[PDB]
From a paper:
The S-protein is a glycosylated, homotrimeric type I transmembrane fusion protein responsible for host cell attachment via its receptor binding domain (RBD) to human angiotensin-converting enzyme 2 (hACE2), a process that is enhanced by a coreceptor, cellular heparan sulfate. The S-protein is made up of the S1 domain (residues 1 to 685) containing the RBD and N-terminal domain (NTD) and the S2 domain (residues 686 to 1213) housing the fusion machinery. Clinical candidate monoclonal antibody J08 binds the severe acute respiratory syndrome coronavirus 2 (SARS-CoV-2) S-protein independent of known escape mutations and is able to potently neutralize most variants of concern (VoCs). A relatively small epitope footprint high on the receptor binding domain (RBD) ridge and the ability to bind multiple conformational states of the S-protein contribute to strong neutralization across several variants.
For structural studies, we generated the following two constructs based on SARS-CoV-2-6P (six proline): one with the RBDs restricted to the down configuration by introduction of an interprotomer disulfide bond at positions C383 and C985 (Mut2) and a second with unrestricted RBD movement but higher stability, containing an interprotomer disulfide bond at C705 and C883 (Mut7). Single-particle cryoelectron microscopy (cryo-EM) analysis of two complexes, SARS-CoV-2-6P-Mut2 + fragment antigen binding (Fab) J08 and SARS-CoV-2-6P-Mut7 + Fab J08, resulted in four cryo-EM maps and associated models, as follows: SARS-CoV-2-6P-Mut2 trimer alone (3.2 Å), SARS-CoV-2-6P-Mut2 + Fab J08 conformation 1 (3.4 Å), SARS-CoV-2-6P-Mut2 + Fab J08 conformation 2 (3.4 Å), and SARS-CoV-2-6P-Mut7 + Fab J08 conformation 3 (4.0 Å). Although Fab J08 has nanomolar affinity to the trimer, the short incubation time during sample preparation for cryo-EM enabled reconstruction of a trimer with no antibody bound, serving as a comparator for our analysis with J08-bound structures. Finally, we find that the alignment of the RBD-J08 X-ray structure onto the ligand-free SARS-CoV-2-6P-Mut2 model reveals the same clash with neighboring RBD and glycan N343, and highlights that even in the down-RBD models there is some degree of structural rearrangement and opening at the apex.
Residue numbers in the entry:
A (entry chain A): 937 to 1034
B (entry chain B): 838 to 887
C (entry chain C): 297 to 618, 632 to 676, 689 to 690
D (entry chain A): 740 to 837
E (entry chain A): 15 to 70, 76 to 296
F (entry chain A): 543 to 618, 632 to 676, 689 to 690
G (entry chain B): 740 to 788
H (entry chain B): 986 to 1034
């Protein structure tokens, strides 16, 4: 049955997909300008001087920190769900197996 | 046409829709839930716990 | 110490702390610019016998030259100079692509209109500069060149138009402007006007009425092959080392290697999924180079409490240890599935886990400990 | 690395936000630790590692598909080996060299 | 200038643009990636007006069409009949306009206060003696005053021979007039068709970016005529329409998902506004 | 309207403005009424867009036929992209592009409110 | 609709943040799906009516 | 645009922040509801069946 | 608090500022990009001219 129907293990495949997509998302999100003239720090620095350059750099720093906070919050929420599953599994080990 | 016509109501549901906030229906309707509940009772009453 | 700073403490408890990443520094810099030997035509643009009327301004293409602006220092004096793209102090480190010089003569009070967001006779009917503008506007007084005692009337401007101009448009037509209901079929009567008027430039005019020569240098940066570069000297190209670099004004840090990428003839730079340059075409030899970041990572520290000892072991997650990109060999190197662990003894006695490392391996401080 | 990408000017500007970066990693560390705890709560309930006896009869009951297969490089049962070949992971080792 | 006659009256044809009209939106190399971008593009499966030149029902279409802020132009040819375009507003010497032509020796681009002909055309005369096809007439305009832009390409010799058989050359262009620049993208694809546009996908590459500074609201296509010993000697009726076709679509702001293959070639695309799927 | 721009549908209003009030606003401080500058009539402004659209898709590796659900359309101009000649009204919206059958089945692609869809046979 | 309100200029500026909007809806979709799963876990335990 | 885009971006960032706040709260609430639903499902099996 | 002082041509006054280039900004008097202070200037044609 397990051999025949791959969807049986979708519950485990889902946690390796979700926690992979999360990092691919963080890398892809680096392309956003976040209101800046460019997403690349090097373009900002090669064309602008500090009185202006620091504004453009700060727009990107704030935006990248926001992306990281979003990631961490989602991982904390997911972790709580996994813990609940793990606690259930531990309970079953004691009550169904032992 | 209902949100456009009844402006005076200041219906919060229309205010939510016009700002892109959408409420979706459940898959199981109240009638279907009632059928499941009734099936469980019929089972409990005529073939209890088997 | 890195752990101590992270934790804001002079004491670190027993366990594993992450400590940034393994990084290397660049040792030298590479500067690559195309080997353009000609100086830009500063003389023709700024030392011209005659300038165009503002209603019919000139647009000259500039290419295949070095923008050495210093040649103007012992000659020209400008009252106005403003860049809307690049801060002036960085112009010499950059290369430019579609470079054009627009030029014309206007009254001094109208100089303020050659800018994004402005209105007035020039901004609306003769020369509109776009809100989105990269370039520099430069201007100077020409009262001793463009003025005549009886008046220099060779300079015209458009006074009447039906609608405003869009950026960089010209209109040199001479149709009669209809102000009223009259058809104006070559009438030029009460409600009909010839659209252009001359500026009466005279040597005795007050400053706001003196002529000014205006040059607008439009340009685009870092997204196409360079045709015009500032006066920077190039260096040799160093491969397979961590270096700093400047390729046609684009700077960064990384390791340059030969690439198998093929660029279309018009493509100068390539980018990754995060829109970061990851390949360049070299300016003198048209070779494509890939750029890989110098740093990489995977470092953590195994610490007995600091209230016991200051000996630590360091784990390098991405090092196989069979230069290893480590801080020190340590003479005690144990390769595990979790990384290369340097500074710990490997013993064959299994035990209960104390400080977990990963992949089945734990560590502890034990005995002469 | 995520925010500045080794740009020096960014790294210095980012110092003012260092307390936020520290907080992000405290949260991630907490998750990472819980993941090993979950594994132990489920599988390390019994600290006596009991050996499967040489097979003796169990009265006709055949447990060979759940017991570890001694011929394999990794002592997984036939069913476990199947489960391991169905869930697909993002990588195949934790060492990736520069 | 010559006013042409002896043409029949037919309705315009229309066709399906399918997936044509994509061009490289940048000058940056990327590969093995999908990229979402917004620009003026021909919408997918749009209504394309089909114009045609054929001797037979003699037809020779050279109408003035609106530019509408961006034009997709394509043609199918066997014998170099489509030569160029006129872009401008009134096209009557009052304002400046852009003339882009291939006159079989040089590619010529001019911006002047041109007075254009009511029926602008170029043409080739066939000499049965020594079997030659030669460039002869050039009409297009009666005057060209106050020229501000001029370019002439290096000399070349174009093949002016008439041809039998199917169309062999598909040429596609995208014309834009933005912030004073007339931008042209193009591609040349070998074909073998009897009629209409082929289905398929190919992205156009940038060709030129012209610093013109003029207002374009309308444009006109310039076709060559063929004349020979077999036609009347009258200049308005003494001509052959040959065989060629062209298609005109219009660009609209759109978002596309573009697919770049391993070598950075755009191989596919999704028109994000085509439908819900 | 006197320099204030926007997009919307203008209709007659029952609002009365005090003599000194030119514009009115909603709970999100967005103009929702104006007094016309030449005729002093109060007009209400309703946004043009409204919503409720989703797509029911068989995998694209099978077919390109899709059905579209319009949550806020009753279908009895319907503010739909196409009539589709196959219009089924459900409690979850007007479903266009799907056949309605009387055979109940196990749920495949859920739509909502008791209705599911599937791709079945000439499918 | 929430952010731009059909302003065209905003809609174009918002393109740079499109990856964030996609992420917000993936999260909401996940919640919406779980709500039907919860209903079935509680009431559809017996498939014999 | 040179100024308008700054003011528009301030609003775009602010509206995205409001939406992220909403989604985070809904995810937290959803987790609490799931726990309640799991309890209800357990009771259905153990108290009713 | 320090007061720097000198005489320049009027067209060069625009160079006494952060971020500028030109003969003065590059070779005679460079004012830093990070600057706190005030730049004040006036015409002295009736004092410094002969
Ligand atoms: C570009 O050319 C068009 C066509 O001549 C100009 O639009 C016309 O403007 C007049 C005056 O307002 C109107 O009476 C016409 O009806 C308009 N015609 C069309 C087709 O729209 C347009 O203003 C010109 N562009 C610029 C910047 O001057
Ligand atoms: C480190 O690199 C080696 C190759 O240099 C990897 O492969 C093993 O190398 C040892 C050398 O003593 C051989 O005895 C093994 O047979 C090789 N294994 C295989 C599968 O070929 C080694 O796996 C790498 N280490 C890590 C942790 O990845
Ligand atoms: C449990 O059942 C398996 C079959 O599923 C038995 O293994 C087979 O043994 C015969 C010899 O008697 C071989 O010919 C087959 O090829 C084996 N099958 C497989 C899949 O390996 C196994 O011996 C039984 N064990 C017990 C204790 O009864
Ligand atoms: C195509 O156009 C070009 C450009 O107008 C023609 O070349 C010019 O011919 C005149 C007359 O002989 C010369 O005075 C010019 O110097 C030529 N210009 C250049 C750039 O060489 C050319 O003859 C035309 N060819 C055809 C077949 O019509
Ligand atoms: C769609 O609109 C109709 C009214 O036009 C709503 O009311 C029902 O209309 C049908 C018409 O065939 C009548 O047979 C029913 O008796 C009407 N119902 C009631 C309660 O009066 C209909 O409810 C609307 N549809 C939805 C999904 O809201
Ligand atoms: C302009 O001409 C003067 C001579 O009248 C010369 O000294 C000066 O160097 C020239 N300027 C440039 C930029 O060539
Ligand atoms: C000059 O440029 C050419 C072409 O890009 C290049 O081949 C050559 O090596 C460069 N350097 C010298 C000294 O000629
Ligand atoms: C062509 O006909 C038009 C009228 O439709 C006329 O104005 C024009 O002058 C004619 N041109 C020639 C060359 O006869
Ligand atoms: C537009 O295309 C459709 C086919 O999709 C056709 O029926 C219609 O006649 C065409 N109309 C015009 C004006 O092109
Ligand atoms: C062919 O002969 C004609 C005269 O009938 C002459 O005008 C033409 O130039 C000749 N062609 C060639 C290639 O010599
Ligand atoms: C346009 O041409 C006329 C001659 O017809 C000439 O007098 C006028 O100066 C020209 N205008 C421009 C801008 O060259
Ligand atoms: C990419 O280029 C290589 C080398 O020319 C070629 O072998 C390969 O087939 C090309 N791939 C595609 C998709 O064009
Ligand atoms: C002028 O304004 C008055 C008062 O607002 C209005 O009633 C009238 O219709 C307007 N138009 C004309 C043409 O008088």
């Amino acid at each position: 049955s397990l051999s025949s129907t791959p969807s049986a293990l979708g519950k485990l495949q889902d946690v390796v997909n979700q926690n992979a997509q999360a990092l691919n998302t963080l890398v892809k999100q680096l392309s956003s300008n976040f209101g800046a003239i460019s997403s690349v720090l090097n373009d900002i620095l090669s064309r602008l001087c500090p009185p202006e350059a620091e504004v453009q750099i700060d727009r990107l720093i704030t935006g990248r920190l926001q992306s990281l906070q979003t990631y961490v919050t989602q991982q904390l929420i997911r972790a709580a769900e996994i813990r609940a599953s793990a606690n259930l599994a531990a309970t079953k080990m004691s009550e169904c197996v032992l | 046409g209902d949100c456009l016509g009844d402006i005076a109501a200041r219906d919060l549901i229309c205010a939510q829709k016009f700002n892109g906030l959408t409420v979706l229906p459940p898959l199981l309707t109240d009638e279907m839930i009632a059928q499941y509940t009734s099936a469980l009772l019929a089972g409990t009453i005529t073939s209890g716990w088997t | 110490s890195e752990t101590k700073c992270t934790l804001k403490s002079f004491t670190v408890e027993k366990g594993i702390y992450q400590t940034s990443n393994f990084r290397v520094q660049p040792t030298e810099s590479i500067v690559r610019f195309p080997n353009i030997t000609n100086l830009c035509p500063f003389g023709e643009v700024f030392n011209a016998t005659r300038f165009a009327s503002v209603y019919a301004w000139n647009r000259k293409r500039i290419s295949n030259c070095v923008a050495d602006y210093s040649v103007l220092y012992n000659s020209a004096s400008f009252s106005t100079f403003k860049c809307y793209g690049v801060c002036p102090t960085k112009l010499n480190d950059l290369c430019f692509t579609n470079v054009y010089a627009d030029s014309f003569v206007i009254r001094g009070d109208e100089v303020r209109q050659i800018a994004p967001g402005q209105t007035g006779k020039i901004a609306d009917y003769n020369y509109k500069l776009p809100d989105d503008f990269t370039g520099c506007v430069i201007a100077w007084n020409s009262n001793n060149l463009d003025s005549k005692v009886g008046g220099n009337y060779n300079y015209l401007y458009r006074l009447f138009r039906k609608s405003n101009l869009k950026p960089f448009e010209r209109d040199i037509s001479t149709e009669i402007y209809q102000a009223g209901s009259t058809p104006c079929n070559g009438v030029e009567g009460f409600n009909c006007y010839f659209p252009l008027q001359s500026y009466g430039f005279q040597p005795t005019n007050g400053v706001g009425y003196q002529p000014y020569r205006v040059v607008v240098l439009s340009f685009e940066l870092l997204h196409a092959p360079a045709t015009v570069c500032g006066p920077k000297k190039s260096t040799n190209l160093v491969k397979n080392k961590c270096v700093n670099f400047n390729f046609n004004g684009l700077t960064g840090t990384g390791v340059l290697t030969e690439s198998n990428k093929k660029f279309l003839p018009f493509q100068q730079f390539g980018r990754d999924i995060a829109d970061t340059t990851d390949a360049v075409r070299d300016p003198q030899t048209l070779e494509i180079l890939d750029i890989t970041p110098c740093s990489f990572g995977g470092v953590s520290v195994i610490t007995p409490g600091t209230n016991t000892s200051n000996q630590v072991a360091v784990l390098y997650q991405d090092v196989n240890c069979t230069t290893w990109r480590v801080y020190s060999t340590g003479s005690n190197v144990f390769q595990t599935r979790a990384g290369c662990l340097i500074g710990a003894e490997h013993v064959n006695n299994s035990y209960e886990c104390d400080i977990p490392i990963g992949a089945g391996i734990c560590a502890s401080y034990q005995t002469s400990q | 690395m995520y925010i500045c990408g080794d740009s020096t000017e960014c790294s210095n500007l980012l110092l003012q936000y260092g307390s936020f970066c520290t907080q992000l990693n405290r949260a991630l560390t907490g998750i990472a630790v819980e993941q090993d705890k979950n594994t132990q709560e489920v599988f390390a309930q019994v600290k006596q590692i009991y050996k499967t006896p040489p097979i003796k009869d169990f009265g006709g009951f055949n447990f060979s598909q759940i017991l570890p297969d001694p011929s394999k490089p990794s002592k997984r049962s036939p069913i476990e080996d199947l489960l391991f070949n169905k869930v697909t992971l993002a990588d195949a080792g934790f060492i990736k060299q520069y | 200038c010559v006013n042409l006659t002896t043409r029949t009256q037919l309705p315009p044809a229309y066709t399906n643009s399918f997936t044509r009209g994509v061009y490289y939106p940048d000058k940056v190399f990327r590969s093995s990636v999908l990229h979402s971008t917004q620009d003026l593009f021909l919408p997918f499966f749009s209504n394309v007006t089909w114009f045609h030149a054929i001797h037979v029902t003699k037809r020779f279409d050279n109408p003035v069409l609106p530019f509408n802020d961006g034009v997709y132009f394509a043609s199918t040819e066997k014998s170099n009949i489509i030569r160029g375009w006129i872009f401008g507003t009134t096209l009557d010497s009052k304002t400046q306009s852009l003339l882009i032509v291939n006159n079989a020796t040089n590619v010529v681009i001019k911006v002047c206060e041109f007075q254009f002909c009511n029926d602008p055309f170029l043409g080739v005369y066939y000499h049965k003696n020594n079997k030659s096809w030669m460039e002869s007439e050039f009409r297009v305009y009666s005057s060209a005053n106050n020229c501000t832009f001029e370019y002439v390409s290096q000399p070349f010799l174009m093949d002016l021979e008439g041809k039998q058989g199917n169309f062999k050359n598909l040429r596609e262009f995208v014309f834009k007039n933005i912030d004073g620049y007339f931008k042209i993208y193009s591609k040349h694809t070998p074909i073998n068709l009897v009629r209409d546009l082929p289905q398929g996908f190919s992205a156009l590459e940038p060709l030129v970016d012209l610093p013109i500074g003029i207002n374009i609201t309308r444009f006109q296509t310039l076709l060559a005529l063929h004349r020979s010993y077999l036609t009347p000697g009258d200049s308005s009726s003494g001509w052959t329409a040959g065989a060629a076709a062209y298609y005109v679509g219009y660009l609209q702001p759109r978002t596309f998902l573009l697919k770049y293959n391993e070598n950075g070639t755009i191989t596919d695309a999704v028109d994000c506004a085509l439908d819900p799927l």
